Design a protein around this ligand. Structure first.
Ligand SMILES: O=C(O)[C@@]1(O)C[C@@H](O)[C@H](O)c2sc(CCC3CC3)cc21
Ligand SMILES: O=C(O)[C@@]1(O)C[C@@H](O)[C@H](O)c2sc(CCC3CC3)cc21
Ligand SMILES: O=C(O)[C@@]1(O)C[C@@H](O)[C@H](O)c2sc(CCC3CC3)cc21
Ligand SMILES: O=C(O)[C@@]1(O)C[C@@H](O)[C@H](O)c2sc(CCC3CC3)cc21
Ligand SMILES: O=C(O)[C@@]1(O)C[C@@H](O)[C@H](O)c2sc(CCC3CC3)cc21
Ligand SMILES: O=C(O)[C@@]1(O)C[C@@H](O)[C@H](O)c2sc(CCC3CC3)cc21
Ligand SMILES: O=C(O)[C@@]1(O)C[C@@H](O)[C@H](O)c2sc(CCC3CC3)cc21
Ligand SMILES: O=C(O)[C@@]1(O)C[C@@H](O)[C@H](O)c2sc(CCC3CC3)cc21
Ligand SMILES: O=C(O)[C@@]1(O)C[C@@H](O)[C@H](O)c2sc(CCC3CC3)cc21
Ligand SMILES: O=C(O)[C@@]1(O)C[C@@H](O)[C@H](O)c2sc(CCC3CC3)cc21
Ligand SMILES: O=C(O)[C@@]1(O)C[C@@H](O)[C@H](O)c2sc(CCC3CC3)cc21
Ligand SMILES: O=C(O)[C@@]1(O)C[C@@H](O)[C@H](O)c2sc(CCC3CC3)cc21
Lengths: 150, 150, 150, 150, 150, 150, 150, 150, 150, 150, 150, 150
């Protein structure tokens, strides 16, 4: 399985800004942890990582995934979760499993973070576990894709 | 007349995804149908087609149209219809006729599709006719631009 | 094809009142223009025109259309667009194509004009083209009814 | 007892349109069933049936009932339930028992059907039993009018 | 001056129903009082009175007034005040002074009576004076029409 | 047929408190009246009555009904109608006919009583007939269960 | 009869500012016109005029009116109409007739002017007649106070 | 570690009702799967399982957990997620990690399921993975409790 | 006088959890303080204390109070204040004085705590005084019950 | 301790107007009762009483209290409770205990009385006990100020 | 140029209360800083400073400014920004430039501070710069008044 | 100090489109005016100017500023002010002073312009001064950065 990991606006600043709220582990470190989760698990998974601050680049990437290459997406759309009907539509149209991850619990913050157009379009959502959420999503994606093969 | 046809996020997937809702005619096929409508009508129209998943590329394109080249725009902003005040402002500022087209009837879907900032900025709106909407928009634009010349 | 053209409350005052907003072309003139569109197109269309200020007369007329006589409706429900669930239900129940036309762009006026119960019930909606909208609707209806025959 | 049965907009299409939602029993058939309920019950009831798509005709009829002739009303105002403050006022002013019936459960459909101005004005409301609701209303009206005589 | 007095749904029941709220003076009595106000004032006014429970009949009547006959309207639209965008549009389009009267203070009742589409379209509104409101409206109309002549 | 009659919070106080609004007939008296309706009708119905002030006891009881014993439920959830998504879900999951009864017209009281999650989940709803509503519900349930057998 | 005329915030600028919207007749001129209406009518009325930009001074004045001196109030609370629950309470507590006047039609302006706490507390409201509204209010007050004496 | 697994209203019907939406795996089967996840992982975890349809029993259980016995809770509050401020407070007061699981994606259903008072009180939330969500929660809890020990 | 003191969900954790917000005085300590207030005052009061996390147990207890034993209730419904229409109805139906106490100022916290269905049903409400509120309520209840005896 | 008792708009009319709702005890009588509560209690309290219908006079008075003279405020802001952010800010800025009292239960009246900006700024709120509320507030203030000294 | 500086409710407490949020610079100090800005700039400006906690005194002052004396106003209406339609109207009617200043960023605080009726009436608004905002406003006013002279 | 000036969507059209609302001074002219303000002031400021119609390019630029090069940002996000939570987050995360400027008063336009996510994230906001706002922002930034150095 190729699994695409899409990281949205501002995620590249992880570990460098607002450590109180988002922690001290960087985005690159999360990606190395995900690799280690696959390698140590001997999972038949190839991870591709992609970060961007552009809505259009997320949509382009999701559309790129219409192919025999990629079998699922794990996405943290950042602030676009709450605003991007376009990304939500791209997810709906992807026709492959998509899992949404948030570092924080978006039910427990400002009112404007409670809506997730993208999350509503995803099969499942994981929030509030920090970096561990991405490993949870990896566990879940492997299990989903194996279920679909069976 | 040069008429610019702008197609927004996800429109490039037409005919390939969710055929139940959006049909089996591709974006390229719609564009060939529009050309055929002009050629068979002997209309003095040059069509330029542009698709993008980027809000900023739509705005750049609309601004590009401030010129003796282009006389009107037919636009399907996709999901940005409901979210993009920036595109709505660009339309307001274009100072040339703009017609909004939607494949679907955005009054008859989710509540979040009912608002169209962009449509409110356009002279007219056409929705719910599938690909035929673009030919309706072409008919209308030709008639508007001929009225303005008179 | 028999196509029924239903014009709602206040439409009979067109061309005589508020010309700034609704123009100087009368309702009778629009109807003659629609005929000319059919005759010059050699379209196999018989138009029937009906105007009324009564919700109940619109519903009676729509129900009248349950028959081998009429194959589609083009309707401008006027202000009843925003208020009449009853007309919306009649449209839903008609089981024939219905197209809604507005002279003005009802996305670009008072907040109370944005809701269209009737438009949500229609296959398609055309707004903001003035009288030309009715010819667009005629073009569209002919194409829809020909598609259904095929 | 004279009991007036008022059937609102679109009810005359019952059994002929949207059978999935509203069933295959016609309005005339419901009225014959109500008669049979009275005759087989030996109830001292004279039914008068009235259907109309006009709000004003419902109000005129309700006002007609200010008389020694009619002792109660069973009404299905159709879509006017949700919109007609005027009919609600007529009901309030009738000074005789009025029972509202809906074929469908208007709590379980679109948000715009949940409000019933007319139902709020009625003594009681019955919804979601299809045609049987009218017999329930008949049972209830007989019992109410007998209680009032005692 | 011909002044048209339009009385909306349920007004014909005045004095006969809910006397606690609407009083014991009938509609016919109000009309005789208005005549007496004109006659005793030696006002150069011809009153025409019209009551109806039909929205469409109000609109037809208002349109009838597009003429050298009638110079102003005093209207109590009843419950249609709160619902009828169509009547509000007819008033806007009338191009003659229109005054709205309510017997009751519609600011001091149910929340659903607070909106008056028709009142917003009228030059002025009078509410809460019972039958006296109509004489106030007559005083006002005479003064307005005399100001316009000067 | 076994028919389960579930009476929710505060119903056990009927006839003892607030007689102006809820009447002077006790809950036990309503239950005896329902029995008499069955016995005098020679209906093949076994009634089981259950009252509780506990949401969880209502849900437990509804789940108890997943069995060859009980064929339908008549429920007055009291105030839980407006609040209990859990009871609404239990009703949805019951897979047997459920009818909601209210003594009062919950469209005609405080705004907070207008929502009925439970009523939306029920096949039908009866409100505003006082104790008679339960007999109406019994009539209806017998007719529904006989229709299902046929 | 002593009639107190209370003029609220900004009314003292009438005729001097925004003549397009509020006209060119000053507050002092309106007061002289009201006197002339009484004198020419030989009405047994003593007018007292009071203008202030202070909510507390309006309330003090209204309370001052608890006395054999003053029999009614005509009030234009200006912008306090929309905000002042305190003035609304003072009006409720006055136990004498109070009539609210607005120069403009507060149904036809900004959304924030539509609410009138004070108007809801008044017996009647007059709006949209400019200065003439005050004479209408005077006519009405005389008639109300004469009715109360009878 | 003792981990308490709390299952709320209606969860005991899993696998027996509405399999389309909630699947065919029973609650007991999920619990055996969780045990197998611990046993096969050689995790130092003792699971305690508790299901109830009572809000008060959930709160009692959570309070029971104030002790050296239990170190974390995995909870699916069912419909109480959307309604129970009391359970949310109990979670806040527990002073131990709590993870919320939903079988379904509560962002993608009825509007009334979008609010989760309980989820906002939890450290993290997992939704839309069916039974697998509970294993994800187990993975997460073990990792959280191990982090806290370090 | 027997005075029933009802303490709702989570109150039994007082003094043990979240001392910053709710203080360090336990529920048992508050109850001993209330006794001391009665004993030192030589008040003719018998206190009965009852805490529960169950809505149904509160309602059962309130209904228990329909008797010559208990003359008033002091209640802190906890989180049920904001949610429980059922408890509010039980209070309305109790026909004895009920006083609501909150430790905290529920006007000064989350928006979801501002509504108190139960408080609206109570004669009076005391909030924000911590444990002292219960003594204030005791002072008040004694004075109310003595006034009723006179 | 000097305790300032501030009474807001309309409170000076207590006992003279609307006795049904606000009772027959005057403001002066409440103040004498408060004195008697202090004198009979031998409390070391000096009361200062201040009533005004002016928002600005309340704010001036509260600011006056920034001094060694006054140690706490008991305030009934009347209708300004619901409207005055300015008074709420003055309370926040006072840096001394402030208790809000309402005669009536402002949770149980019009929707517009439910918001209390001032109450949210106060340490505690007492409502619905009539004049007794002020003695409750006095009891509470003495206890608060004694706690602060310790 | 005479420039009037109006400071609203509570501003006189600046530097003495809540220094964390509003700083330690007093109102008098801000006024001396503004003078120094004019003197050091050799600006042809005469400053007049006015602080008050009374809405009516602000309106009186603004009206005072209708004169050859004063050419512009810099205003911080304090909490009246969010509530005072009357002050907003006075500003609209002033017919001279008015600039609104807030010490804090009123977009970044409580929801109830986001609305500024007064700010909407002003030419420009400055917020969130503390005392420096007043010097920014002075810079701006000088530039505006010089532009108007040219 | 390096100060970054970020200009958002559509700002590049300034002076060329809608001069009535946005004036005739171009963006390049504003930038030259800002330079002149620095040069004539002998301010130790290096301005960098950046305009874009892309949300992602604004975020990239803001992140670019995490460096010893740039010390503050002046931003006009255009229409993204009202929509872009992503840009608001980037501003929050920048950890350097950011000032928002709008040419127009966004409190005085369409309702949809009133929300500014970005402005809420900024230290301060300036609106309604046209091009002068940018010089005000420059004055302010210099003063802020000098205060931080001290
Ligand atoms: O919790 C999450 O994962 C969010 O998706 C919630 C979003 O509401 C928010 O915009 C953001 S911003 C962000 C990266 C912040 C990093 C430290 C620089 C993550 C998220
Ligand atoms: O009906 C339309 O034309 C819409 O503009 C309505 C928008 O709400 C929606 O986001 C989308 S997505 C889309 C392309 C979908 C294509 C099959 C891959 C079109 C539209
Ligand atoms: O733009 C349209 O076609 C509308 O359907 C929009 C509706 O909101 C409105 O009530 C009206 S009124 C009207 C006839 C006005 C004619 C000059 C006398 C048309 C319409
Ligand atoms: O369920 C009901 O009885 C309703 O009153 C609910 C209303 O919301 C609705 O407009 C309609 S339309 C209708 C007649 C439909 C018939 C098959 C042609 C009934 C009703
Ligand atoms: O106060 C008024 O004049 C109203 O226009 C207010 C409307 O809200 C209401 O529907 C009605 S109904 C009515 C006639 C009632 C008559 C005794 C049978 C008048 C009015
Ligand atoms: O009208 C009904 O049947 C209601 O279900 C409506 C609900 O809103 C309400 O909580 C209550 S309370 C109740 C029992 C009251 C009994 C005299 C002690 C019934 C109901
Ligand atoms: O139309 C009315 O009478 C109003 O009461 C409506 C209010 O909304 C408004 O604040 C104002 S301001 C005002 C005096 C304006 C005068 C020319 C300086 C009157 C009114
Ligand atoms: O998806 C979930 O896990 C939910 O927590 C979502 C809730 O909104 C809902 O009430 C319910 S009902 C339920 C058990 C249903 C079982 C088949 C009988 C689970 C849930
Ligand atoms: O302030 C109050 O008294 C409240 O009634 C306000 C409610 O909103 C809240 O749910 C709770 S929770 C609670 C007990 C908390 C105890 C330390 C474990 C009290 C209350
Ligand atoms: O109940 C209370 O104490 C209130 O603060 C509630 C407020 O909403 C109301 O404006 C008023 S008016 C008032 C004095 C009324 C007196 C008999 C002349 C008190 C109050
Ligand atoms: O930030 C501002 O300038 C405000 O105008 C915002 C308003 O919302 C607020 O009421 C207040 S209160 C105030 C003076 C507070 C001083 C330390 C005693 C200023 C303001
Ligand atoms: O007033 C401002 O500075 C705004 O930021 C307000 C925004 O709501 C709006 O989208 C726009 S569009 C714009 C550039 C318009 C230029 C003439 C082509 C500026 C702004």
């Amino acid at each position: 399985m190729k699994i695409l990991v899409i990281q949205g606006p501002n995620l590249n600043m992880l570990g460098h800004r607002d450590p109180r709220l988002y922690g001290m582990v960087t985005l690159d470190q999360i990606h190395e942890i995900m690799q280690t989760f696959v390698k140590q698990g001997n999972l038949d998974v190839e991870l591709e990582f992609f970060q961007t601050n552009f809505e259009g680049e997320i949509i382009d990437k999701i559309q790129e995934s219409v192919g025999s290459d990629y079998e699922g997406i794990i996405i943290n759309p950042g602030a676009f979760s709450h605003t991007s009907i376009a990304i939500a539509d791209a997810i709906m149209l992807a026709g492959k499993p998509v899992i949404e991850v948030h570092l924080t619990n978006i039910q427990a913050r400002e009112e404007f973070r409670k809506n997730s157009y993208t999350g509503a379009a995803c099969g499942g959502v994981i929030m509030g576990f920090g970096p561990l959420g991405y490993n949870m999503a990896l566990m879940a994606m492997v299990n989903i894709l194996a279920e679909m093969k069976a």
